[PDB]
Amino acid sequence: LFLLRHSSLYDSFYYSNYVNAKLSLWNENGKKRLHKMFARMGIPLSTAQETWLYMDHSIKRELGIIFDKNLDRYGLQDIIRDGFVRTLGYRGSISASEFVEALTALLEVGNSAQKLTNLRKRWVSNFWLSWDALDDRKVELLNRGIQLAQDLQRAIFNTGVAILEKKLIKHLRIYRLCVLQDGPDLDLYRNPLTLLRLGNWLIECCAESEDKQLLPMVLASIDENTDTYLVAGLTPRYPRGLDTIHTKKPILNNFSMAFQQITAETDAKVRIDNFESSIIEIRREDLSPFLEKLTLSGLL
Amino acid sequence: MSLPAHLQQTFSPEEIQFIVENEPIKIFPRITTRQKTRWQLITTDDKALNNMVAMRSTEVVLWIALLLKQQSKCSIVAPQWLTTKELDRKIQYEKTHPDRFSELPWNWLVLARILFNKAKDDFHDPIHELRGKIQDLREIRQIKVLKGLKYLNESHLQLDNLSLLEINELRPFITEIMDKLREIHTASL
Amino acid sequence: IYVSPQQDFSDLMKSWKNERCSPELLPYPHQLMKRLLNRISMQSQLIENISMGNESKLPLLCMETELERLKFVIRSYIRCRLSKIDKFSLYLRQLNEDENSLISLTDLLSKDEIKYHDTHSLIWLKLVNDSILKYMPEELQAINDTEGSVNMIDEPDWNKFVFIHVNGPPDPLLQENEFGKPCYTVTIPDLKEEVELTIGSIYVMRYEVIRDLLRDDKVALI
Amino acid sequence: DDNTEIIKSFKNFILEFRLDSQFIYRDQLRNNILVKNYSLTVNMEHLIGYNEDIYKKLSDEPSDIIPLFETAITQVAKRISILSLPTFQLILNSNANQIPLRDLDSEHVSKIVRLSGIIISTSVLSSRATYLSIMCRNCRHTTSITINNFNSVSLPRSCLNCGPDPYIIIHESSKFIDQQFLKLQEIPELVPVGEMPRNLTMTCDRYLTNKVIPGTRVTIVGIYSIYNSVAIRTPYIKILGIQSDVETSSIWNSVTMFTEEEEEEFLQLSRNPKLYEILTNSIAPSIFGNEDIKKAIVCLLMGGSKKILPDGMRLRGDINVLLLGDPGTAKSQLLKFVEKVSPIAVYTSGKGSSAAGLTASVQRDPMTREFYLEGGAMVLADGGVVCIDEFDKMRDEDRVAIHEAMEQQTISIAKAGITTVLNSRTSVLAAANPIYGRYDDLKSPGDNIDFQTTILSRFDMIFIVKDDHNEERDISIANHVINIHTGQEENGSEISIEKMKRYITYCRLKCAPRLSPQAAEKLSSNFVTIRKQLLINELESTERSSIPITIRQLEAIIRITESLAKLELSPIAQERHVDEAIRLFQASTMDAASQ
Amino acid sequence: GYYDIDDVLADGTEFPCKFQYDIPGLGYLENNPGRPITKNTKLSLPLWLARILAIVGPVPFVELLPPDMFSTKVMNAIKTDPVALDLHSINSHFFSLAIKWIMLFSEKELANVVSELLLQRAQELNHHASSLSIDLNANIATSTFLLKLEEMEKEIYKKSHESYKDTKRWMFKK
Amino acid sequence: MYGDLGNKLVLEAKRTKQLYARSNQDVNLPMYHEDIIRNILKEVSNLRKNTEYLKEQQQLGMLDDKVAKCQYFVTLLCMERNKRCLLAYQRLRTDILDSMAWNNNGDTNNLSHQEQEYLKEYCDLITDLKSGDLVDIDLSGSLVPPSDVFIDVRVLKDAGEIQTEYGVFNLIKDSQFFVRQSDVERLIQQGYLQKI
Numbered sequence A: 001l002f003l004l005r006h007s008s009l010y011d012s013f014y015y016s017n018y019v020n021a022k023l024s025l026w027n028e029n030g031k032k033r034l035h036k037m038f039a040r041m042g043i044p045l046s047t048a049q050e051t052w053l054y055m056d057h058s059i060k061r062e063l064g065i066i067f068d069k070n071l072d073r074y075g076l077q078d079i080i081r082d083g084f085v086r087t088l089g090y091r092g093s094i095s096a097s098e099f100v101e102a103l104t105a106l107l108e109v110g111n112s113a114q115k116l117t118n119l120r121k122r123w124v125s126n127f128w129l130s131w132d133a134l135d136d137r138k139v140e141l142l143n144r145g146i147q148l149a150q151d152l153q154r155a156i157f158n159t160g161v162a163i164l165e166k167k168l169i170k171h172l173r174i175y176r177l178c179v180l181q182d183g184p185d186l187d188l189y190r191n192p193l194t195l196l197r198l199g200n201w202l203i204e205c206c207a208e209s210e211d212k213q214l215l216p217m218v219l220a221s222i223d224e225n226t227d228t229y230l231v232a233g234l235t236p237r238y239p240r241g242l243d244t245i246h247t248k249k250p251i252l253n254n255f256s257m258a259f260q261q262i263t264a265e266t267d268a269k270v271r272i273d274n275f276e277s278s279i280i281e282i283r284r285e286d287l288s289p290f291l292e293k294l295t296l297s298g299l300l
Numbered sequence B: 001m002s003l004p005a006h007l008q009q010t011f012s013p014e015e016i017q018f019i020v021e022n023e024p025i026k027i028f029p030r031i032t033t034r035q036k037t038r039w040q041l042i043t044t045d046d047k048a049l050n051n052m053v054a055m056r057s058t059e060v061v062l063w064i065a066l067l068l069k070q071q072s073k074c075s076i077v078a079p080q081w082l083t084t085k086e087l088d089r090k091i092q093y094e095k096t097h098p099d100r101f102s103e104l105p106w107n108w109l110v111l112a113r114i115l116f117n118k119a120k121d122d123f124h125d126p127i128h129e130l131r132g133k134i135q136d137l138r139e140i141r142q143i144k145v146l147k148g149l150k151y152l153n154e155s156h157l158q159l160d161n162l163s164l165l166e167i168n169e170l171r172p173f174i175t176e177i178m179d180k181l182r183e184i185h186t187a188s189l
Numbered sequence C: 001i002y003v004s005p006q007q008d009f010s011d012l013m014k015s016w017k018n019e020r021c022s023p024e025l026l027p028y029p030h031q032l033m034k035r036l037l038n039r040i041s042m043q044s045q046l047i048e049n050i051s052m053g054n055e056s057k058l059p060l061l062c063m064e065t066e067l068e069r070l071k072f073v074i075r076s077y078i079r080c081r082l083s084k085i086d087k088f089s090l091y092l093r094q095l096n097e098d099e100n101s102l103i104s105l106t107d108l109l110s111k112d113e114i115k116y117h118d119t120h121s122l123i124w125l126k127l128v129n130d131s132i133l134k135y136m137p138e139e140l141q142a143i144n145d146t147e148g149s150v151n152m153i154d155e156p157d158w159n160k161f162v163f164i165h166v167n168g169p170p171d172p173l174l175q176e177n178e179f180g181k182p183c184y185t186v187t188i189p190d191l192k193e194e195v196e197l198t199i200g201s202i203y204v205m206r207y208e209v210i211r212d213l214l215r216d217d218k219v220a221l222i
Numbered sequence D: 001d002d003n004t005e006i007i008k009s010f011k012n013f014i015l016e017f018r019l020d021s022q023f024i025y026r027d028q029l030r031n032n033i034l035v036k037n038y039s040l041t042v043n044m045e046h047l048i049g050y051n052e053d054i055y056k057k058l059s060d061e062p063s064d065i066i067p068l069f070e071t072a073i074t075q076v077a078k079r080i081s082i083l084s085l086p087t088f089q090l091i092l093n094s095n096a097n098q099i100p101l102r103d104l105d106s107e108h109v110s111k112i113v114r115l116s117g118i119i120i121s122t123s124v125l126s127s128r129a130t131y132l133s134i135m136c137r138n139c140r141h142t143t144s145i146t147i148n149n150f151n152s153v154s155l156p157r158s159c160l161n162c163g164p165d166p167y168i169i170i171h172e173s174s175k176f177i178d179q180q181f182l183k184l185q186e187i188p189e190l191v192p193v194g195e196m197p198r199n200l201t202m203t204c205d206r207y208l209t210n211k212v213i214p215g216t217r218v219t220i221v222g223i224y225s226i227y228n229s230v231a232i233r234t235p236y237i238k239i240l241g242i243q244s245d246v247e248t249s250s251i252w253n254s255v256t257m258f259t260e261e262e263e264e265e266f267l268q269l270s271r272n273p274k275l276y277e278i279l280t281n282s283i284a285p286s287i288f289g290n291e292d293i294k295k296a297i298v299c300l301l302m303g304g305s306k307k308i309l310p311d312g313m314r315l316r317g318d319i320n321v322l323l324l325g326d327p328g329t330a331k332s333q334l335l336k337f338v339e340k341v342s343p344i345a346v347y348t349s350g351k352g353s354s355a356a357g358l359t360a361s362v363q364r365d366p367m368t369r370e371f372y373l374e375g376g377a378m379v380l381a382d383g384g385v386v387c388i389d390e391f392d393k394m395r396d397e398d399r400v401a402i403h404e405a406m407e408q409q410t411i412s413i414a415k416a417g418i419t420t421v422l423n424s425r426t427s428v429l430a431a432a433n434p435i436y437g438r439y440d441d442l443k444s445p446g447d448n449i450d451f452q453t454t455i456l457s458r459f460d461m462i463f464i465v466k467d468d469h470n471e472e473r474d475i476s477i478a479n480h481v482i483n484i485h486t487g488q489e490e491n492g493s494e495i496s497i498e499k500m501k502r503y504i505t506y507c508r509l510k511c512a513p514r515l516s517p518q519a520a521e522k523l524s525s526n527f528v529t530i531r532k533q534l535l536i537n538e539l540e541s542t543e544r545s546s547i548p549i550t551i552r553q554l555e556a557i558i559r560i561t562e563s564l565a566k567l568e569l570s571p572i573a574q575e576r577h578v579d580e581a582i583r584l585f586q587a588s589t590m591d592a593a594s595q
Numbered sequence E: 001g002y003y004d005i006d007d008v009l010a011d012g013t014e015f016p017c018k019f020q021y022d023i024p025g026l027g028y029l030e031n032n033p034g035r036p037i038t039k040n041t042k043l044s045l046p047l048w049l050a051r052i053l054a055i056v057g058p059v060p061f062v063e064l065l066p067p068d069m070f071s072t073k074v075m076n077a078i079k080t081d082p083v084a085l086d087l088h089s090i091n092s093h094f095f096s097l098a099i100k101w102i103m104l105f106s107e108k109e110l111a112n113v114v115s116e117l118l119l120q121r122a123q124e125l126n127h128h129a130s131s132l133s134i135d136l137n138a139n140i141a142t143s144t145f146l147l148k149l150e151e152m153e154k155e156i157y158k159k160s161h162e163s164y165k166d167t168k169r170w171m172f173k174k
Numbered sequence F: 001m002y003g004d005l006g007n008k009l010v011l012e013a014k015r016t017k018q019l020y021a022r023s024n025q026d027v028n029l030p031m032y033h034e035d036i037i038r039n040i041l042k043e044v045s046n047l048r049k050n051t052e053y054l055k056e057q058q059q060l061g062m063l064d065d066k067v068a069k070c071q072y073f074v075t076l077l078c079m080e081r082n083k084r085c086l087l088a089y090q091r092l093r094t095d096i097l098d099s100m101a102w103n104n105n106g107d108t109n110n111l112s113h114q115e116q117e118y119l120k121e122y123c124d125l126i127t128d129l130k131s132g133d134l135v136d137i138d139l140s141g142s143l144v145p146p147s148d149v150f151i152d153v154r155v156l157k158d159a160g161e162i163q164t165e166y167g168v169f170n171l172i173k174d175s176q177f178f179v180r181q182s183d184v185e186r187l188i189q190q191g192y193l194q195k196i
């Protein structure tokens, strides 16, 4: 669940990749199903929306019992897990997953070639905020990171809703494609980390499920300030928590090889300087030829 | 001018820490420097450092001891006045004598702050208990200082057994108020 | 009288504290400062020699840190002395001008301090004579006048209150009290009062009265 | 039995709670006892962290455990301040979800709740008993009672023969505390569909009294309880904490509620070379153009400086602004923004107002049959700004009832015995339409304005906004509005509403510039030229000018100069401000008069 | 001090005086210029002028009348409740002028009154300076008492507050 | 009267001192009040003219002894008061200039030319002092006692590979060092580095 101990029990379910994948919360039927689940579990809607610290303690203590019988019915059974929780005397206890989420959020939104250099300098600056957040003498930074993480997850949810409602995902035979051109919050996705966050959200919902064949996905976003795309190939993922011989085998990311081959062959003007070779930059007018050649390559 | 206005007529807390860090302390060396290079100091004595033997009590300057502790090459032996029982006794003495200060060292607050910050695993009592005891002692002495401030006058004043940090805290108020009182009195004649 | 480097550092610290808390400008310890500066230079050379050449890591760190500490103490002492000279420039000029006065600047100041005093006095007098004094009549054209409505020469606050610690001799003035403890006796002429200064106690006294004890090292300002 | 253990537990929280190396509550208590503030503010997140069991008790039965946490505080305070003091107040802070005012019902009785609202009325302080000394009528036996103000107490019914109720209170030996009553209305947006806003009665004790004024949004932590006044009880909230965005205490008394760290930020902002541009851009970021009106609004928010001459005459220090123009100009939106940025403001429509609604009204108390005075819009807005929209729809009498309060800043009443002269120091920002809805250039200016010269002369700056159809400007406005519809600078070119409001408060309570001689000579020459210009214009046309230029306009120019100087915390107003003031006056009032 | 700004400001307050001679060509002291100033004239002169005129002149040139800042009402108010009194309104340099007056006339009643006032006020001054705020998430009395302080008391309070604040910052430095 | 201008100048000096005290790190001397000083000196000039006229009248005039004494005393006192106010203002400004000169190792339009010359030659004097027998000490050094031998520092503003006396530091913006405080103390003072 997304930041269980720093938000309401409702928000943790609402803004969770797995829950949204298994319930399709992006449409009204999903919200109805989630409300049905909460009603069945015996948690009043007012109680669930209350923040974690002040929630009624009977339900907080019984959460393990209430979750275990109820979750299997809705297909959300794998939410149950064992993790690491660290407490400093008389302070709130925080888990490893939420700490990592706070650090990542601080990295992402903590705060021609000239603008690119400026953006990279800003990210290098954010590195030190995230590094400071690792010291127990700096807890305000960690709280600031949790707040920013909640904001970022809300924005990613809205963008994914806009993508899925419009059916912007084109299902080709070699891969899936999704290009953003006029979104409301398109300034956010210049950072590779936020773009990968949105990519993971999409990969889990309506791509991991639906009993569809595993197909790699390409996600691209535009920024008017520089008139270029930030393409990002993403590896497919097997259904979560489904141990199997085929699931045991790992899946590699071949987009680096194909991207390099196409860039060398075509006069792409692609930038392949990012450490993650699957992420490049393309000019506004080269994406169509690039994707045509990608489809015709067959090495994806 | 050459000296800032906040360092004129008084010392800063860092200056008091600097002064405190020259007093000797007892350490247990984790290395054997004694021979059966060599330290060469000019501000203190160097014979003790040149003659160290593992797990043998010896005395060195506090700042050298802190430097060694930073390297996990010595374990500071906390003073005898900084045990739980001694602090209970001092608290009782303060409680039973409303008109006097206890006989704590002239560097108890500063040394307590330094050792709690730096050497947390060299005490034989829980750190929280010692922090509580020092807080209680500080409150009692603060009450006594507040009561005693009502006797400022154009003549001398006596504050026996008051520590260095407390005197540094109170130096401006006491000195300026007594100076104004003296000025008024002298103008009278 | 030299004893050991440790004693020299102890006297340096005594002088530093007394100068910081005293209202007047104390005499300069010429011999001690000469010895200390020479030792600083020699120790710097020794550290450089050793460094030019892993068990030896810690001793070098300790020597360098000690050198930093000693340099800081001397720096603060000299800076405070310079500030006091700035405040009492006209007073020291008055001392030198008078011939009946016992004190002379060559004993009360070092060579660097006397150079600073003369140069800064000249500079400031130039500035004020250009800006202001050259327009006033011949009568009000002196930067050191004591016969006007207000005295222009600032003297040290003789009766300033200073915290003192009575540590006794390292004695004719010493005596015992009703309780049998050693003590000193001083008189405050303004109040005609006699105040006992028992050993090992802290007092908030006027500087004038305990000035002689401070000079003889019987008490030390906190 | 259990009470002593509960008291012991809350005493150990105040003596053992450290988050790092500082005892937060032990030190807060000592610092409060030193300034004579016998209370302790505890954050409930810290108590849930020490021992969750202590929070469970304080939340399960609040009116039984809160009285036992006060005595623990008192015992610790005695231990900390007295070397061997009334009962200490406990103020609570919480971050729990706020319950809407109208969602409070039987399910929340005797529970700690958090809610927000608008304070509409405050009562005169009463006196509640905390320690009674009593005696018996017959046998004259002395006793005492101790009372905590948490209800679920009366004098003993039987003595300790003596008839029923034998005890009479001995007042000269008893002790009392302060009590206040507040009415809380729900926020206008929270109200459900087609419903009038609902009220709720609240009571505060001791150090929570005189903390709010009517018309200020607040957040309340308290206990939803009931008191009997058949088998129904009238609900009310027992306040345990008040949080507000308005420093009412600073506004009523001196300068307060600004930390040195907060104060340092304001000085740094004032040192900005182009603070004028930032403030102008910060007003109505979503309205395109109208820069002159935004500068005028900045000056109106800043205000001038008021003077009390030795002979007793007082000079107005506030600026009044009128916006006359065609439809669709965004005058109402500017008024709605100014109501939201100013520390104190009231938005009223000239049509839905009355002479008594503004100023003050005389009301009869149904119980005492005694007439008393209740303040209206201009009293509720005292020390701030009144936004009178639809100024042309107001009736002649209701408009005439505003002249003295606009100029002299006082509301003289002589009705039902009540005879007084209240104080109303407010700035009026009015929006109006011409007679024909659109300013028709064909007809003379005396035909487009029905306002009389007396009311118009009271406005410092008059803006005659005309809508001209220009393709370039039209395209620009279309692009801006579409961007607004489909679509955060905060990079030194704009400051949020909260910071701007705090800066307005700081400047008002910290600066009051004065004119230098050069500015006086400049303004005096300009007044002579403007008056000559009106005369040349009048000689040309038989008709007498509809927009007047009297001494009030000279004083208005002086006020604008002083406000511009105050904007930058400059104790003296120089010519660099006089030029801007003259430019604004020419852009608004001489511009209106020229037509 | 000669270069002490506060002393220069203090020496500039106006004290009542009464001339005792007939000095033509001294009108500028009076409102009107260039007119003789007749004897027994009452006028307010700055201290730096009035004092020297009072000590220099046999009969001096002027006699100092009792200032309204040392009247019987003010002394009674000082004795009743020193802490609650608003000294800033009586005069912003009260203590400096009081010391100067005591020196000029060597009167001991005023000396004792002023000393007691100063001690009692300093008690509350230290009470406020010792009180340091705390931020739980991460007043009125202090402000109302600060508003009443005289200039010298405002300097002493600032110095003591800074000293306490520095010590607290050093002790609890993480 | 005759000291109102001096009083106003001293009030401005008090405001300057209060600003200097309130300011944390950045202090800029207000513009030299040339106009008020010009007015004060003009007033002193008229006072000198008055004294000369009084002396001339006494030499040949009906003036008497008491009247001459009184006027000659009231003019001298006024001149003294003006001089005191002027000197106090100038001394405050010079003290702030001294503090600035020491804060640096050794805008300007605000200063008057005399103050500019004073500051220049005072920095010369400070450097001369630093060159003497106290060379081993950095007289314009840090007045906070040395506490830690090694500190973490961060580069606050980008600059080339500055070659300090202690060594070569590649000051890349947003990069941290683990170094000895003694070496990088000057860079921290200038603002190229921060302790964090």
Ligand SMILES: Nc1ncnc2c1ncn2[C@@H]1O[C@H](COP(=O)(O)OP(=O)(O)OP(=O)(O)O)[C@@H](O)[C@H]1O
Binding pocket: D286, D287, D288, D289, D325, D326, D327, D328, D329, D330, D331, D332, D333, D334, D431, D432, D433, D477, D481
């Ligand atoms: N820059 C703008 N200029 C004008 N109108 C705007 C602007 N931006 C938004 N609006 C629209 O203005 C409308 C508000 O009406 P407005 O305040 O302009 O009327 P008014 O001219 O003051 O009143 P009336 O038409 O009764 O005379 C809102 O619909 C708002 O969307």
Ligand SMILES: [Mg+2]
Binding pocket: D331, D332, D389, D431
């Ligand atoms: Mg409208």
Ligand SMILES: [Zn+2]
Binding pocket: D136, D137, D138, D139, D140, D141, D159, D160, D162, D166
């Ligand atoms: Zn009875």
